[PDB]
Amino acid sequence: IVGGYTCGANTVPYQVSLNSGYHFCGGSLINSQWVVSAAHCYKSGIQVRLGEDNINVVEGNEQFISASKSIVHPSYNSNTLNNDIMLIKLKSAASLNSRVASISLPTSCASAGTQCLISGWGNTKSSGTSYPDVLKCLKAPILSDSSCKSAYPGQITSNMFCAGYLEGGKDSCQGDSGGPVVCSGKLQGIVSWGSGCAQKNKPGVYTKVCNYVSWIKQTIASN
Amino acid sequence: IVGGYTCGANTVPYQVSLNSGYHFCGGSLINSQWVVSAAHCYKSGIQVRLGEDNINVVEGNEQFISASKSIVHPSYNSNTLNNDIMLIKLKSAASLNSRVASISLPTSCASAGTQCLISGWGNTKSSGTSYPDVLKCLKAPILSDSSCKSAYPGQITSNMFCAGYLEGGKDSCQGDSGGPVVCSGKLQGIVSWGSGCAQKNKPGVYTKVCNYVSWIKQTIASN
């Protein structure tokens, strides 16, 4: 998160850290056994770390559950990052408590101007490379489809939204990938891509979770 | 209290006024020797005033007992106001009558929608400024964790819940800090913080007392 603030300890209980020795991607807990992330965050063997605030220090609220089944969307294109959504199943159900909780799936898609929470342990810098220990938060609005199409001409598909600022300064960055964009209590976006971080007329593009509620709901029942 | 009503005389017998030359914070009597307040209501010199209705006129039911022990929760953060709870021991035991009584600790956590009574000598305006002589009361519901987080993104932890109105108009304000949120006979909340007072989609944030019952019982027994 570039231009955001340090989240309060466990204020984002649905946020998980995808681990493979170190932190590489983010995700969101939607039930006791299922984490939803990004398809470009796929790798064979992921440890899902829940209840984190400081990813480099053990605090007492962490549940470390390895992935048992990593499912990528079948219609995922990695030329356009279309359908950039991934389902990860845990070994065991995670113990849902006051600081490890689930986020609701969208009952409807979110209008432009609606406010959302983007979170991650990703890069706080826009230039070289710099990673924070504590989770970072970004309050950003959903931009109209028109602004998104004009910011990335011929690039923003059906299954994409832009969330943030045309002025720049505030955006998600490298490492925030797969992370939650939660609007009005519902997971409306997954951190996908953008042109750099916090650039002018270059807001972050996010996966439309509302297009995949049936696919997720079916896949969860399936497996 | 903004948008509340003037409390009946001694209708809130567990309500106390923290004094340090003048009213600044509130508290709740949980036994004859212990007042529970907020950690951000800390001061090295507190006189605990019990049995008050008009804090500016001596009425005859008042017990003025200086604080002997002000104990702040050890894991208290005053950047995020997490663990915003404080225990105050009196010099002398308070004389428990019909106008000075104890409030019960929560036997269980409170559901969303349950109604509660918030009380205080804090500011009655959401606009300018007005501080009352007489205690003020507010009937307000417990909001869902989702609504609280949606109102304060990256700010509401485990140990915080929201009590009030997304519509606005009714809320606690500056000067109500440390005061009781009592639901169905039990102390479920302590007046902590919020973004202004009585603003739209900005309800008051309160310390979740049900998370600290063991800490209170132990701290009181220890000391």
Ligand SMILES: [Ca+2]
């Ligand atoms: Ca940690």
Ligand SMILES: [Ca+2]
């Ligand atoms: Ca292609």
Ligand SMILES: [Ca+2]
């Ligand atoms: Ca840091």
Ligand SMILES: [Ca+2]
């Ligand atoms: Ca008042």
Ligand SMILES: [Ca+2]
């Ligand atoms: Ca009165």
Ligand SMILES: [Ca+2]
């Ligand atoms: Ca007791």
Ligand SMILES: [Ca+2]
């Ligand atoms: Ca008086």
Ligand SMILES: [Ca+2]
């Ligand atoms: Ca003593």
Ligand SMILES: [Ca+2]
């Ligand atoms: Ca402390």
Ligand SMILES: [Ca+2]
């Ligand atoms: Ca004394």
Ligand SMILES: [Ca+2]
């Ligand atoms: Ca009690």
Ligand SMILES: [Ca+2]
């Ligand atoms: Ca609610």
